[PDB]
Amino acid sequence: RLEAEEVYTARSILHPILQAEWDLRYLEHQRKEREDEAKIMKDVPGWKVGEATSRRRWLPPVESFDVRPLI
Amino acid sequence: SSLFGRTEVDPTGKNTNRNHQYLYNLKVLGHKTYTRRDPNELQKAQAEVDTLSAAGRLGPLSPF
Amino acid sequence: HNDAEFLGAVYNFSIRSVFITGILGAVYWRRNLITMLLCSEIAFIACSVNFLYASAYLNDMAGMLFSITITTISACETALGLALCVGYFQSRAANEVEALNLLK
Amino acid sequence: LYNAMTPAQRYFVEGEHVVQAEANRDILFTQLDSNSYLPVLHYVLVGTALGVVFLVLPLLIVSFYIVSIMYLLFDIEVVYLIPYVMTNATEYMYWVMQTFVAILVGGFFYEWRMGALEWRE
Amino acid sequence: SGFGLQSGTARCYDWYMDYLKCMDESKAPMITLRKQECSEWLEDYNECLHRDKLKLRKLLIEREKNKQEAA
Amino acid sequence: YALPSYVIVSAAWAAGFWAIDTYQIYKEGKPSWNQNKDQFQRALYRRDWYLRREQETIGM
Amino acid sequence: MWENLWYLDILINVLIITIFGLISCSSSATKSYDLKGCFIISMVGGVYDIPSAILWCLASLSILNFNGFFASLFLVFTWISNLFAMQSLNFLGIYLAFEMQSLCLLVLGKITANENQRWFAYRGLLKYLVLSLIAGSIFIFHASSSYLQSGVMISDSLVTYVFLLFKLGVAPFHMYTLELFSVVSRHVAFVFSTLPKLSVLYLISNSNIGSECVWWGLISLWLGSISQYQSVFVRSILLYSSVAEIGLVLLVLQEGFSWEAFSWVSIYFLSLSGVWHANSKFVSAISVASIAGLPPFLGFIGKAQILKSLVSINLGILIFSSILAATISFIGYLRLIRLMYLVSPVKWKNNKDSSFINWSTWMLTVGTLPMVYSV
Amino acid sequence: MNLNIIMTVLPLLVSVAFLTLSERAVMGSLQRRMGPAVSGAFGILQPFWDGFKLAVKEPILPANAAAGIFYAAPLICICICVASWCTLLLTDLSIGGLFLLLLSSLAVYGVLLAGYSCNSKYAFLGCLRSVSLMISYELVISVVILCVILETRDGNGFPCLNLTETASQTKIILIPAGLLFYICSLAESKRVPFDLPEAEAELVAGYNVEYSSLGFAVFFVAEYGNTLLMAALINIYFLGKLNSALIAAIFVSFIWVRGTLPRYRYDMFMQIGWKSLLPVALALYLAQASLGY
Amino acid sequence: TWPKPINPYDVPSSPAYHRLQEPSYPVIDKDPDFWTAVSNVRKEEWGTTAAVAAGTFVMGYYLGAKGHTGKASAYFTSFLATKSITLYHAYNSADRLMGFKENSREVVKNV
Amino acid sequence: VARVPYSHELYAMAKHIVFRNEKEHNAILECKAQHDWPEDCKPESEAIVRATNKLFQDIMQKAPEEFKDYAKCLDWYGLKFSKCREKQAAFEAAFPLSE
Amino acid sequence: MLLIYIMLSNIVVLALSVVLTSSPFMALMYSILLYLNVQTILWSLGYDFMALIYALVYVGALAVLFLFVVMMVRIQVSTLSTKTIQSVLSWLAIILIFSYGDVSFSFPCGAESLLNFGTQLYSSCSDLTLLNSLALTIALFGSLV
Amino acid sequence: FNNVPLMATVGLLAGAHEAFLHYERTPIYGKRTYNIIKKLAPIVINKTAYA
């Protein structure tokens, strides 16, 4: 029980930093993607790059690095 | 419960009809609601971070 | 272009085929009572797999609980049905030939 | 070998080096293939091939029904008990488990009382 | 249900709860009316569940990119 | 005599256990490859793998 | 933890009675009246409303005519399934409760058949099982597709409506009742053609499980009436009468008339009790008359509630069909009356076990005047 | 694939052969005899002679039986034994011992299929008796495993059934459950006390007796392999980290108990498993559950 | 996203059934124990319990005598009915303590 | 590209972070709890990333061998703190926490 | 991706084989192989315990029950082979019609945890676990008599 | 053309009913010289066309 509490404490400390670096990486990738999208959609009229799919809440990516099929 | 439930009348009359599902989810799971940060605060904070980085007080974005 | 869309379509085709093969298979190709209950099990398994798939899609536990319920009820139903089949077969009169094959 | 197909799965790492490294990788438990059942299936194929080789080499040169049903129903009861052992139970989880066990012990008592457990039949 | 697979809650539990809260706020005498008033929240929940708008947007981008490449 | 047959079984399994232990510790890189991993540990290992590959790409 | 105690008490009660009955099993008391009384007392702990009190009344009356600890235990299991069906909030509650009830039907049917009756009883139980498996599998497959598409399990859907249509036995999903109930014991057929209905009606009324389509009740009304008229066997006449009536009741219940269906089910139970447990010609005649809907008996009040509800919705086709189908049904009931007193001398077994039968006949005669307020 | 599979399979084959040699070496020692000395001098090579000779014997064409199922039964057993050992030594599967329990429930198929091949009225009852014994003592094994999982937690505190983590600590509390695991292991290997076969199988009631070539060889080899797997499981769960010496000692113990105990009748062993072993294992489970975390 | 860390020993859990209601009356005890609820049961309720117990003893004996086991049935029926009524009374008293139901007498008796 | 030290390193510096970097950790927790969108929390994410990287660098100079030794021990023992008590105590002595 | 596809496509061939075969014993064997393929499909969606459950309850126990019944009731069903070319194509057409153009959703991967599953089964969802236990008791009592 | 689908459906249901009744009686065990579909297809087609 005490080793578990130590491990939990450590993990709770690391989680903010890992989520912050993931979020920052997400932001640079999304920016690069939007730059490419704007480049591709320059010809098409009435297209707005960076339109919000969800009006209010942030939509997280369904696919994640952590979950990988067992087979 | 999650799968089953029964209904009783309120003698006092204070409690009234609301969605049972909503009330259950609020009591057992809870609702997380988030706001959107106003742009001026964010701009100032970001500028402050950048200023400190230029000064060199803050550390590297990447360790190596 | 998207592997997941292709895989989702393949899964949907496969699961639907397995369901129809279970429900209508033994009746179509006339079989004994034992094959009818085995195909009924195949169909229930297909539905439970669909629930597990949905639970993975929505990150929800409801399908996993419905699926454990299917496993329990399906096994109880099969055990009772097989008991009925044995009792039916032990009471067969000499004249009766394919007693188990009602669909004949 | 499952391969990440999106940038988010690849931890937003750019380049084609990563894709090649991932595809030609080895199944390591301390890397990208943890709790993987693919080795088990490689083992099943090896075992089947080994048997097939042995098999082909020389060629060139009422109580039972009752026990089955009781086994199936007790097995499902144990399947229900398996999640409980895999959690650090609280007082209320303990009492729910105790009710479940009481129902199982009642069914066992019915089997004992009615003579099903005796195998004379 | 509403519970998550690993912990917490389902991937789109909050969107559904938002829609339920909107329906609770509404004073319409029938459920049909309230759903009509809260339809936009339902559209957000459906959007988070299946990402249909994002898929359409990606399809259009890919198709235009193919058209540019062929030309 | 029971002892020679018993010795052969013991030694053969000891040799197999050593060979698998060393082989794995050589490839996986640690004696703890077999230890149980939860979701957090699996995600950490996956992140480490992707970060190492990114570092390799950056270096060259 | 206190809310859980209410539910927990029922389980504790059932287990202790089960183990007491097992320990005190002897030839001296084959009819365990004491256990029957304990079971009745136990089922009072699940009464929360008026529909639950009707469920208790019907279960207790059914329990009286079962012989032996085993049958009464399986009736208590049926009661538990019925109580949980009324409280089901999603697909899992519906599926679980109804399939448990199906299991209890399969056991009750199996354990009330003699060795000479096994050939036909086990065939009818097997046919019931296979049809039930088709219904349950189609239900769960569609429920899975709905859960995937919507993300939530909501009991307001076409999938549940079609499933509950199968459970009621209307439109083309009434054949299991005909095949199974013809070959089983009279009590088992009576208790499982009335009690299960109350739970389904409660679920439909409370969970808004109604459709705009009137074809299924119209079909059940016409098919049942014509098949009742053309049926030579008396069991088929009684079985098809329930099909026709439950079709009409289904049509009335979709439009929101819950009170009338809950009063109808109680009157129908009392009316069917005396015809099914036939011992006296007079009791059977009064029962047939009540099922027919003759005005001096309580059956008239039950039919009146449904007909009165029909005129409010103002659907002409339903009213016309109802009148003609009722006439056709009346011809079948007249056939039943003719068979008893106008065809040949009738001799029946002296099964002097009229537990609630005299009370039911009295309640049918006497009850019309007290319940006149409803109609 | 991986080179580890070779390093697992080859030791299993050598070890199983010497297991067969040990069985008779011990039985001879108990009965004031000696280990076979006409095959060679050291006696190391005695099993290879049997296996090589069994290869030479002329094949018999199958009679009045389906060919597929006849071929399938050896493949099924040779697959289960391999998968078991390779999931016992080369995997990190969080619920790995549960997988082993699943792999042990599949050993029933080989016996059943062998019985089906006979297609004899007596053999139908004989196979049903063997499978009844296996399922009856597999239920008890499952309850014992449940007792094993209450006491097995990992460093991070997450309950699981990883063989490495259960092996890491030795818990003396579980020893009451290890006795039941040992009796059940004897039953699952059809040892003498639970050896219903031998009495029934003197006449050709039905069993793997039908095979008399590479088919019969794999069955016997698999029998010893399963017995050794049970010995490994007894070591890994109740006796600490995997020790080759302990696995061999447990096998020797099996042989000793075999020799010193007479066989049981059909009703007697099954009555032991349902009305004796199962209540004891349930009491041990409830006691461990009530002790708490 | 990142998996949230879970503490195995303290995993959030809740009972199956929940009463969706805000306490209308004062909350004498937020989470009453069984003994606290039993101690707050009214005298009239205990009288009902004893009347039920006696009646069920007589009915149990009557029904048991037809099967030659009157005493055993009488005691079992008494125990069963007393237990069920007592649990009902304790549930009602716990609800009164929680403030869901009227607790005027309860608050006065135990301040 | 935002990047932070490897798992073994983060575990070895975990105790130090909450004593030395409290400000950034609290800030990031509060903002993350308040705002779902990742852009809204970009300043605090950048802050905690930079702070962790700075901590890694100052540990690498002040106690180069002690940190490396602890990180290797933790990696060898599969990120289990209990087995590395001696090395942890040495590293903590060499580089005191909470300044 | 190839392995997941192969398993998904195979499940159809293993389901078709059961109905087509005329031997009840062989149909069970194909069903057992179908159950194993379902375990392997579940492994690709990220479930380990659930896939174990399917194999334990169905392969381990239910299949044994089916074999026991089949042996006791053994009938001569090798009468005639009726698998005319016309019949098979009609069956494959019915299957194709039913299993076509349904709503498809992207393949998901979801890590499961027993700690959460056990917690929910014995706390929030205790009502289901006990009703299922009652269902098992009903089956036990009815089957044994 | 908008309202015929109903009549066509009813005719198809009636023809399927009659065709099934004919098919059910025919014996699987005995080999039949004639093709069953050739016998049954006119039933369904004619009923649907007349309706």
Ligand SMILES: CCCCCCCCCCCCCCCCCC(=O)OC[C@H](COP(=O)([O-])OCC(O)COP(=O)([O-])OC[C@@H](COC(=O)CCCCCCCCCCCCCCCCC)OC(=O)CCCCCCCCCCCCCCCCC)OC(=O)CCCCCCCCCCCCCCCCC
């Ligand atoms: C003494 C006072 C009684 C007066 C009033 C009764 C109310 C107080 C209850 C007091 C108890 C007396 C029982 C009489 C009524 C039973 C109702 C009831 O009890 O619960 C209702 C009551 C609250 O529910 P509610 O009053 O119905 O209102 C809720 C909502 O309004 C929602 O419920 P709703 O459905 O009523 O909603 C209103 C409804 C309007 O509904 C109505 O108008 C109802 C009309 C009343 C008809 C009465 C006949 C019903 C048959 C049931 C017979 C009672 C059996 C007794 C069972 C319980 C025994 C105690 O509107 C609708 O449209 C819904 C449709 C309703 C059905 C349609 C009515 C037709 C029924 C069939 C009639 C057909 C005729 C057939 C034959 C007739 C021949 C003459 O619950 C309680 O107070 C607690 C229950 C506690 C019971 C047992 C617990 C004590 C013992 C604990 C441990 C037990 C173990 C130890 C054993 C001890 C002994 C050994």
Ligand SMILES: CCCCCCCCCCCCCCCCCC(=O)O[C@@H](COC(=O)CCCCCCCCCCCCCCC)COP(=O)(O)OCC[N+](C)(C)C
């Ligand atoms: C406002 C009321 C109108 C609404 C109607 C619904 C409400 C019901 C109100 C009155 C209900 C009365 C029910 C009448 C039942 C008739 C009594 C009965 O059935 O006795 C049986 C009882 O049979 C048994 O099986 C006895 C077993 C249990 C005995 C009673 C159980 C008592 C449990 C406690 C009940 C109290 C209720 C608990 C709290 C409400 C005896 O008959 P037999 O001996 O089997 O055969 C008779 C033979 N012959 C007539 C031809 C001579």
Ligand SMILES: CCCCCCCCCCCCCCCCCC(=O)O[C@@H](COC(=O)CCCCCCCCCCCCCCC)COP(=O)(O)OCC[N+](C)(C)C
């Ligand atoms: C009037 C107030 C006091 C009445 C005295 C009764 C107090 C005794 C405590 C309660 C015991 C049960 C009450 C008796 C009612 C039913 C008992 C019964 O079934 O009567 C006979 C048989 O059944 C009947 O005859 C039916 C009688 C129906 C009830 C008639 C009695 C009416 C008043 C009794 C109960 C009134 C209230 C009881 C206290 C509240 C029992 O037969 P045996 O088991 O063989 O016992 C006889 C003993 N021995 C032969 C060995 C000498």
Ligand SMILES: CCCCCCCCCCCCCCCCCC(=O)O[C@@H](COC(=O)CCCCCCCCCCCCCCC)COP(=O)(O)OCC[N+](C)(C)C
């Ligand atoms: C028809 C219903 C079918 C489905 C029913 C589902 C609903 C029932 C689900 C519950 C099953 C039983 C689980 C226990 C029920 C009530 C909970 C309970 O009483 O346990 C107490 C535990 O409290 C106790 O009083 C401990 C002593 C309990 C002793 C026995 C009471 C429960 C007996 C259960 C019956 C099972 C025993 C064997 C079955 C015959 C409450 O838990 P905690 O408050 O978290 O733990 C105490 C910590 N603290 C108070 C400080 C917050």
Ligand SMILES: CCCCCCCCCCCCCCCCCCCC(=O)O[C@H](COC(=O)CCCCCCCCCCCCCC)COP(=O)(O)OCCN
């Ligand atoms: C009493 C203390 C009070 C506290 C309560 C605790 C209760 C005991 C719990 C402790 C757990 C350990 C129990 C050990 C397993 C024995 C199981 C119960 C003993 C028993 O009933 O005897 C026989 C079962 O043993 C057998 O005969 C099985 C067959 C044995 C053959 C193989 C034996 C292998 C060697 C023994 C294991 C040693 C391991 C290492 C060598 C049944 O027979 P019965 O008919 O007489 O009983 C029926 C009489 N109604």
